Structure formats: structure tokens, C-alpha cells
Short mmCIF file of C-alpha atoms and ligand atoms in Angstrom, two decimals:
data_model
loop_
_atom_site.label_atom_id
_atom_site.label_comp_id
_atom_site.label_asym_id
_atom_site.label_seq_id
_atom_site.Cartn_x
_atom_site.Cartn_y
_atom_site.Cartn_z
CA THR J 1 6.41 -5.60 -23.12
CA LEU J 2 5.99 -8.90 -22.07
CA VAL J 3 2.21 -9.43 -21.88
CA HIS J 4 0.18 -10.58 -18.79
CA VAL J 5 -3.52 -10.99 -19.61
CA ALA J 6 -5.93 -11.84 -16.88
CA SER J 7 -7.76 -15.55 -15.64
CA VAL J 8 -10.16 -16.26 -13.45
CA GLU J 9 -9.43 -18.91 -10.67
CA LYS J 10 -10.86 -22.00 -12.21
CA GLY J 11 -15.02 -21.87 -11.34
CA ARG J 12 -14.74 -18.96 -9.18
CA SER J 13 -16.43 -15.65 -8.46
CA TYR J 14 -17.75 -12.90 -7.09
CA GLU J 15 -18.51 -15.24 -3.71
CA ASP J 16 -15.42 -16.61 -3.35
CA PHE J 17 -13.57 -14.32 -3.73
CA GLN J 18 -15.49 -12.37 -0.56
CA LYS J 19 -15.01 -15.42 1.23
CA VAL J 20 -11.34 -15.33 0.98
CA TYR J 21 -11.84 -11.07 2.06
CA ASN J 22 -13.97 -12.15 5.08
CA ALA J 23 -11.37 -14.57 6.60
CA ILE J 24 -8.80 -12.33 6.07
CA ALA J 25 -11.11 -9.02 7.52
CA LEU J 26 -11.61 -12.02 10.27
CA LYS J 27 -8.30 -12.53 11.13
CA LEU J 28 -7.11 -8.81 11.59
CA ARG J 29 -9.52 -8.39 14.08
CA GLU J 30 -8.17 -11.35 16.10
CA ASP J 31 -4.36 -10.43 15.92
CA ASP J 32 -5.58 -6.93 17.39
CA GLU J 33 -2.14 -6.97 19.25
CA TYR J 34 0.24 -6.88 16.32
CA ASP J 35 2.47 -3.93 16.67
CA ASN J 36 1.39 -2.77 19.92
CA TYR J 37 -1.75 -3.00 19.27
CA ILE J 38 -1.89 -1.25 16.05
CA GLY J 39 -2.76 -4.89 14.31
CA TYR J 40 -1.93 -5.69 10.86
CA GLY J 41 -4.36 -3.23 8.67
CA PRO J 42 -0.60 -1.06 8.02
CA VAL J 43 1.62 -3.71 6.74
CA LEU J 44 -1.21 -5.43 4.72
CA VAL J 45 -1.28 -2.15 2.95
CA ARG J 46 2.61 -1.99 2.45
CA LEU J 47 2.84 -5.34 1.33
CA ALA J 48 0.41 -5.10 -1.70
CA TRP J 49 1.91 -1.48 -2.59
CA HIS J 50 5.43 -2.90 -2.53
CA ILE J 51 5.11 -5.97 -4.03
CA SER J 52 2.72 -4.11 -6.44
CA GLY J 53 4.99 -1.27 -6.77
CA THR J 54 8.18 -2.99 -8.32
CA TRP J 55 6.68 -2.55 -11.66
CA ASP J 56 8.07 -1.38 -14.58
CA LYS J 57 6.30 0.52 -17.23
CA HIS J 58 8.60 -0.07 -19.73
CA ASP J 59 9.17 -3.31 -19.91
CA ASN J 60 6.37 -4.69 -18.02
CA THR J 61 8.82 -6.60 -15.49
CA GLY J 62 7.14 -6.56 -11.54
CA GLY J 63 3.77 -5.80 -10.40
CA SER J 64 1.20 -7.96 -8.83
CA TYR J 65 0.32 -10.79 -11.22
CA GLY J 66 3.10 -13.05 -11.35
CA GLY J 67 3.04 -12.79 -7.19
CA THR J 68 6.78 -13.88 -7.09
CA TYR J 69 9.24 -12.04 -5.50
CA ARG J 70 12.95 -11.77 -4.20
CA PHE J 71 13.06 -9.79 -1.21
CA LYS J 72 17.09 -7.87 -0.95
CA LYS J 73 18.62 -9.33 1.86
CA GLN J 74 15.60 -11.75 3.00
CA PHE J 75 14.27 -8.58 4.44
CA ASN J 76 16.92 -7.59 5.85
CA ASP J 77 17.14 -5.03 4.33
CA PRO J 78 15.76 -1.35 5.58
CA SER J 79 13.78 -1.07 2.05
CA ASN J 80 11.32 -3.89 2.73
CA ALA J 81 12.06 -4.64 6.45
CA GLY J 82 8.74 -5.80 7.80
CA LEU J 83 7.00 -6.79 5.35
CA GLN J 84 7.55 -10.43 6.19
CA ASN J 85 5.08 -10.26 8.98
CA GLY J 86 2.41 -9.60 6.71
CA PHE J 87 3.03 -12.79 4.40
CA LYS J 88 3.35 -14.38 7.54
CA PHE J 89 -0.22 -13.21 8.48
CA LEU J 90 -1.64 -14.47 4.25
CA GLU J 91 -0.21 -17.50 4.76
CA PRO J 92 -2.59 -19.44 6.99
CA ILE J 93 -5.34 -18.12 4.49
CA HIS J 94 -3.64 -19.06 1.73
CA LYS J 95 -3.79 -23.03 3.04
CA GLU J 96 -7.46 -22.51 3.96
CA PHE J 97 -7.77 -20.52 0.17
CA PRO J 98 -5.34 -23.24 -1.88
CA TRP J 99 -7.17 -21.71 -5.36
CA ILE J 100 -6.54 -17.66 -5.15
CA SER J 101 -3.22 -17.03 -7.19
CA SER J 102 -0.59 -15.24 -5.02
CA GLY J 103 -0.65 -11.90 -6.53
CA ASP J 104 -4.65 -12.14 -5.94
CA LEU J 105 -3.94 -12.89 -1.64
CA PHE J 106 -0.80 -9.78 -1.85
CA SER J 107 -3.01 -7.13 -3.56
CA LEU J 108 -5.87 -8.38 -2.05
CA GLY J 109 -4.97 -8.22 1.49
CA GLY J 110 -4.45 -4.68 1.01
CA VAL J 111 -7.90 -4.33 -0.40
CA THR J 112 -9.04 -5.80 2.41
CA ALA J 113 -7.36 -3.89 5.29
CA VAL J 114 -8.17 -0.28 3.73
CA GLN J 115 -11.47 -1.19 3.85
CA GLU J 116 -11.49 -2.91 7.73
CA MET J 117 -10.21 0.27 8.15
CA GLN J 118 -13.16 2.27 7.37
CA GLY J 119 -11.15 3.18 4.23
CA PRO J 120 -12.60 3.48 0.37
CA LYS J 121 -13.83 0.66 -0.93
CA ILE J 122 -11.77 -0.72 -3.89
CA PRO J 123 -12.21 -2.37 -6.11
CA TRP J 124 -10.55 -5.27 -7.18
CA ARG J 125 -10.24 -7.34 -10.18
CA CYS J 126 -9.38 -11.50 -9.80
CA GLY J 127 -6.94 -12.94 -12.76
CA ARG J 128 -2.91 -12.56 -11.28
CA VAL J 129 -1.47 -15.71 -12.84
CA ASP J 130 1.59 -16.78 -10.28
CA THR J 131 4.70 -17.12 -12.63
CA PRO J 132 7.56 -19.47 -10.72
CA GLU J 133 9.62 -19.24 -13.18
CA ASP J 134 9.91 -15.49 -13.45
CA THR J 135 11.00 -14.18 -10.25
CA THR J 136 10.76 -10.45 -9.75
CA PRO J 137 13.44 -8.64 -6.47
CA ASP J 138 12.33 -5.87 -5.29
CA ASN J 139 15.97 -4.67 -4.77
CA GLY J 140 16.49 -1.09 -6.48
CA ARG J 141 12.56 -0.96 -7.35
CA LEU J 142 10.88 1.03 -4.33
CA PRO J 143 11.70 4.14 -3.78
CA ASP J 144 14.35 5.64 -1.44
CA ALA J 145 12.70 8.13 1.17
CA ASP J 146 15.65 10.24 2.22
CA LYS J 147 15.00 12.13 -0.92
CA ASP J 148 13.34 16.02 -2.76
CA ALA J 149 9.74 16.69 -4.47
CA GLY J 150 12.14 15.82 -7.74
CA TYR J 151 12.91 12.22 -7.16
CA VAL J 152 9.58 11.46 -6.75
CA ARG J 153 8.05 12.95 -9.17
CA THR J 154 10.50 10.47 -11.29
CA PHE J 155 10.30 7.95 -9.70
CA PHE J 156 6.40 7.06 -9.47
CA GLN J 157 6.67 8.01 -13.79
CA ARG J 158 7.68 4.27 -13.63
CA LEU J 159 4.99 3.46 -11.49
CA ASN J 160 2.55 5.78 -14.77
CA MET J 161 1.38 8.24 -11.98
CA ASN J 162 0.81 11.39 -11.91
CA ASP J 163 1.08 14.31 -9.47
CA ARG J 164 -2.47 13.65 -8.28
CA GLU J 165 -1.97 10.00 -7.76
CA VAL J 166 0.97 10.09 -6.39
CA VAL J 167 -0.32 12.68 -3.50
CA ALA J 168 -3.09 10.73 -3.14
CA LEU J 169 -1.27 7.86 -3.04
CA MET J 170 1.51 8.85 -0.45
CA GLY J 171 -0.86 10.00 2.31
CA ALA J 172 -1.76 6.38 2.69
CA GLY J 173 -4.60 7.31 4.75
CA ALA J 174 -2.25 8.02 7.57
CA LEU J 175 -1.64 4.03 8.07
CA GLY J 176 1.11 2.58 10.91
CA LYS J 177 4.15 3.84 10.96
CA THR J 178 7.60 4.13 10.19
CA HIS J 179 9.93 2.05 12.84
CA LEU J 180 13.42 2.68 13.58
CA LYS J 181 15.07 -0.60 13.55
CA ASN J 182 13.51 -1.86 9.92
CA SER J 183 13.92 1.44 7.89
CA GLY J 184 15.61 3.86 10.29
CA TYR J 185 12.74 5.76 10.48
CA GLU J 186 10.70 6.04 13.74
CA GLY J 187 7.43 6.81 14.25
CA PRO J 188 3.43 7.51 13.28
CA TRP J 189 2.08 10.40 10.69
CA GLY J 190 -0.98 11.02 12.69
CA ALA J 191 -3.16 9.72 15.89
CA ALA J 192 -5.26 7.03 14.57
CA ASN J 193 -2.56 4.41 12.95
CA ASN J 194 -5.63 1.71 12.02
CA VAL J 195 -7.97 4.09 10.95
CA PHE J 196 -8.17 5.36 6.97
CA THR J 197 -7.82 9.24 6.51
CA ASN J 198 -7.63 12.47 5.05
CA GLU J 199 -5.36 13.25 8.43
CA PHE J 200 -1.71 13.01 6.93
CA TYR J 201 -2.44 15.84 4.77
CA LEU J 202 -3.90 17.77 7.39
CA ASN J 203 -1.33 17.19 9.94
CA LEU J 204 2.09 17.64 6.80
CA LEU J 205 0.06 21.44 6.96
CA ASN J 206 -0.59 22.25 9.70
CA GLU J 207 1.40 20.54 12.68
CA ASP J 208 4.53 22.45 13.65
CA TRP J 209 7.37 20.53 11.63
CA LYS J 210 11.04 20.38 12.95
CA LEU J 211 13.81 19.20 11.30
CA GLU J 212 14.84 16.65 13.31
CA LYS J 213 17.88 13.47 13.38
CA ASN J 214 16.42 10.73 14.67
CA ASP J 215 18.80 8.14 16.67
CA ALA J 216 20.04 5.73 13.35
CA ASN J 217 20.92 9.55 12.51
CA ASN J 218 18.44 9.71 9.48
CA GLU J 219 16.87 13.32 9.16
CA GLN J 220 13.26 13.55 9.32
CA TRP J 221 10.80 15.62 10.40
CA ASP J 222 8.84 15.94 14.05
CA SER J 223 5.96 17.65 15.26
CA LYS J 224 5.30 18.04 19.37
CA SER J 225 2.10 16.10 18.46
CA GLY J 226 4.75 13.04 18.35
CA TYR J 227 4.02 12.66 14.57
CA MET J 228 6.75 12.15 11.80
CA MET J 229 6.92 12.74 7.68
CA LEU J 230 9.93 11.49 5.80
CA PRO J 231 11.44 13.70 3.50
CA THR J 232 9.43 12.69 0.78
CA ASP J 233 6.40 13.02 2.38
CA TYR J 234 7.67 16.61 3.70
CA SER J 235 8.31 17.73 -0.14
CA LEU J 236 4.73 16.98 -0.87
CA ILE J 237 4.65 20.59 1.09
CA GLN J 238 8.14 22.57 -0.84
CA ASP J 239 6.56 21.42 -4.12
CA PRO J 240 4.41 24.37 -5.31
CA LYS J 241 2.10 21.67 -7.38
CA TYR J 242 2.33 18.65 -5.33
CA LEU J 243 1.42 21.57 -2.02
CA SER J 244 -1.62 22.39 -4.04
CA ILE J 245 -3.38 18.66 -3.63
CA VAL J 246 -1.88 18.54 -0.75
CA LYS J 247 -4.26 21.26 0.69
CA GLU J 248 -7.24 20.05 -1.40
CA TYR J 249 -6.91 16.59 0.33
CA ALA J 250 -6.74 18.28 3.26
CA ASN J 251 -10.11 19.72 2.30
CA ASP J 252 -12.18 17.31 0.96
CA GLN J 253 -11.96 14.20 2.78
CA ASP J 254 -14.53 12.68 0.20
CA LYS J 255 -12.82 13.74 -2.74
CA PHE J 256 -9.45 12.19 -1.51
CA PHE J 257 -11.08 9.14 -0.85
CA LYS J 258 -12.30 8.41 -4.38
CA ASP J 259 -9.18 9.04 -5.73
CA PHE J 260 -7.04 7.45 -3.51
CA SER J 261 -9.51 4.45 -4.51
CA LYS J 262 -9.17 4.52 -7.90
CA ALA J 263 -4.86 5.15 -7.64
CA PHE J 264 -4.48 2.37 -5.47
CA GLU J 265 -6.41 0.21 -8.09
CA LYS J 266 -4.51 0.79 -10.25
CA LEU J 267 -1.02 0.56 -8.81
CA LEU J 268 -2.44 -3.03 -7.97
CA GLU J 269 -3.62 -3.70 -11.42
CA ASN J 270 -0.52 -2.08 -13.15
CA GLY J 271 1.10 -4.98 -15.78
CA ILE J 272 -2.74 -7.02 -16.53
CA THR J 273 -4.31 -7.21 -18.98
CA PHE J 274 -7.77 -7.42 -18.38
CA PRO J 275 -9.30 -9.56 -21.25
CA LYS J 276 -12.60 -7.78 -23.08
CA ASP J 277 -14.71 -10.94 -21.26
CA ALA J 278 -13.00 -10.49 -18.05
CA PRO J 279 -15.98 -10.24 -15.36
CA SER J 280 -16.48 -6.27 -13.41
CA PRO J 281 -15.03 -5.57 -10.38
CA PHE J 282 -15.83 -6.93 -7.29
CA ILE J 283 -16.95 -4.58 -4.41
CA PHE J 284 -16.30 -6.21 -1.15
CA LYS J 285 -18.90 -5.78 1.35
CA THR J 286 -17.05 -4.93 4.90
CA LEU J 287 -17.84 -7.06 7.57
CA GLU J 288 -19.90 -4.11 9.26
CA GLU J 289 -21.46 -4.15 6.17
CA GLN J 290 -22.50 -7.93 6.11
CA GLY J 291 -22.90 -7.55 10.12
CA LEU J 292 -20.26 -10.27 10.67
C1 LIG C 1 7.83 7.74 -1.47
C2 LIG C 1 7.37 6.79 -1.80
C3 LIG C 1 6.96 6.48 0.15
C4 LIG C 1 8.25 6.29 0.07
C5 LIG C 1 9.70 6.75 1.20
C6 LIG C 1 7.73 4.93 1.22
C7 LIG C 1 8.56 5.04 2.85
C8 LIG C 1 7.94 4.16 3.97
C9 LIG C 1 9.22 3.95 5.01
C10 LIG C 1 10.49 4.60 5.02
C11 LIG C 1 7.62 3.69 5.89
C12 LIG C 1 8.57 2.62 6.85
C13 LIG C 1 9.25 1.50 7.00
C14 LIG C 1 9.07 0.24 8.14
O1 LIG C 1 9.45 1.45 9.59
O2 LIG C 1 8.59 -0.12 8.68
C15 LIG C 1 7.35 2.97 5.20
C16 LIG C 1 5.50 2.53 5.43
C17 LIG C 1 4.54 2.02 5.04
N1 LIG C 1 4.35 2.30 4.23
FE1 LIG C 1 5.09 4.00 2.58
N2 LIG C 1 6.70 4.41 1.06
C18 LIG C 1 6.04 5.40 -0.04
C19 LIG C 1 5.39 5.16 -0.58
C20 LIG C 1 3.60 4.33 -0.16
C21 LIG C 1 2.98 4.58 -0.45
C22 LIG C 1 2.13 4.64 -2.26
C23 LIG C 1 1.54 3.58 0.12
C24 LIG C 1 0.70 2.96 0.05
C25 LIG C 1 -0.26 3.20 -0.80
C26 LIG C 1 2.77 2.38 1.43
C27 LIG C 1 2.13 1.95 2.41
C28 LIG C 1 3.04 2.18 3.92
C29 LIG C 1 2.43 1.84 4.52
C30 LIG C 1 1.26 1.79 5.28
C31 LIG C 1 3.65 1.44 5.90
C32 LIG C 1 3.14 1.71 7.23
C33 LIG C 1 3.83 0.19 7.51
C34 LIG C 1 4.20 -0.60 8.76
O3 LIG C 1 2.84 0.29 9.58
O4 LIG C 1 4.16 -1.55 8.88
N3 LIG C 1 4.09 3.46 0.85
N4 LIG C 1 6.83 3.61 3.66
#
């Protein structure tokens, strides 16, 4: 198991990272038109999870720390197609703040997007360090969507995530949508695409789902309301343990926010050793809380 010790960007503290937060949040506001006015919030949240989700607990490869990845077929793979827009969004931020590492920026982008879409506060730690010499390909490390509950449970054990963590994670605020041309799946999980909610769980339990074939010839669960669920999403109510938790989050927004917050931060911090002398996690204020 390689060891990856967090190292604070030289001389930086809270206020420096809140400035990066603010520029990300302000660009989020400014580039409102992206993806039929969904904006960049959702792809940023997906970007943070994708780079973090390359981690393997068994040898500590991958993860957010090194910020250095090689994306299968340079994003023209259904597993990662669409993420380049997220990296392109963060390039001007990186140019404005060249001192932040890549792992810190990718992960802070996901935290910023969640909060600015009114999701829970997500504490965030700095100190990931680029590892240009050691690149992690995402190839085969992220999960397939045409699978069942056992697949999902087993996949996530590699990320040291349990049933609750997994169900909290996948709902992912019901942000954004699947795009047929990226992934071979089409449609949103809910009606409020760029607001962080527990509506994934509600829709899953309350919508009338039909198992259909999309124009890419892949099966997905569809509702007359125009929502969709991937086979892996749907499995969360086919498995009896997952189903209980789905119901729990459907019925308690605050519990879901708190569980999501813990699991997302954990996900974003996997693979990383924080010195005992490391600063405490930062909780960034939103633009709205700052009156900006
Ligand atoms: C079993 C695990 C999961 C599967 C199979 C998977 C599958 C998918 C697929 C197929 C898409 C569509 C990509 C495209 O068409 O644009 C996608 C979207 C997305 N994923 Fe995942 N995902 C899973 C886990 C996660 C989790 C844990 C998060 C974050 C906590 C998440 C975040 C998102 C978000 C926010 C998008 C929307 C992107 C956009 O609107 O541009 N996913 N995912």
C-alpha cells in the first residue's frame, strides 16, 4: 500500500481555499447555459466522484490525491464521456490559482457544486499533491450501469463503502442527467436537475417505472413523468437491504444530507493520510451566505 501524506499548499489557509471556492461558485453562476441550462454543477460533482472512484483500497492506487489520470479513449468511452467539460470548466480556475494542486481542485469543485446547488455542507481538507510521475488510468475502475445489486455492493467494497454509504452516494442529489450520446443512457433522475435533493429516493419508490430499451438499445427504467433509473439505480429497491435505506432517505431529507456529507467527504479523502498536525477540515461559506 503506497502512502500519500497530505501536504498543505505552502503558506495557504482557510481564506485562500474560500477564494477558490468563490471563483468556482461564481463561474457556476456565470456559465448558466451549459447543457440546456442545467449548468456545470452536476458534471463537477460527477468529475469529483469519478477521479476519487479510481481508488483501490487494496493497494492504495488511484483516488483523488495524485490528481493525475488517463481517461479511457480520451473521454470517447461511455464510462467517462462528458467529463472533459468539467475539466475544461476548471482550467481558468486553475490558471487563476496555480498554487492549488489538481486533486484539491477536482475535489473542491465537487464540494462547491453540491453546496451551491443547496445541498449539505461538505467539510473539505486540503493537501493532496500532484504525482505527475504516477498516472492512474480510469480504465476498468469505475462501475458499469447495466448490473444488479450484488454487482453494486461488491464494486463499492473496493472503495471501502458499506450499504448506507453506497445508497447515499448513488442518489447523488438527483443532480444532472444521463445523456444518450455519452453513456448510452438518456434522461434525468428527477425534476430538479440542478438542485441537490433526496428526490432520487422518492422518485424511485413513488414513480411507476417501466423497463424499456433506449435508442442505444440499452435497458433503463422509465416513468411517464419523464424520469429514468439505470439498472444499478433500480437495484437499490430490488435488494431488501438497499430498499430499507432508500426508504429511510425518502422519508428524512436531513438524515440523507448528513449521510451524504459524511460519505462524499470520505470518498474524496480515500487513499490520503492526514498528518496529526494537519489543519482541521474547512467548511466553506456559500456565495449566498457571503452575500456575494
Ligand atoms: C453504481 C454507481 C453509479 C453508476 C453505474 C453511475 C452511472 C452514471 C451514468 C451512466 C451517468 C451518465 C453519464 C452521461 O451520460 O452523461 C452518470 C451521471 C452522473 N453521475 Fe454517476 N454513476 C454511479 C455513481 C455515482 C455517484 C456515487 C455519484 C456521485 C456521488 C455520481 C454522480 C453523477 C452525476 C452527478 C452525474 C450527472 C452528470 C451530468 O449531468 O453531466 N455517480 N452516472
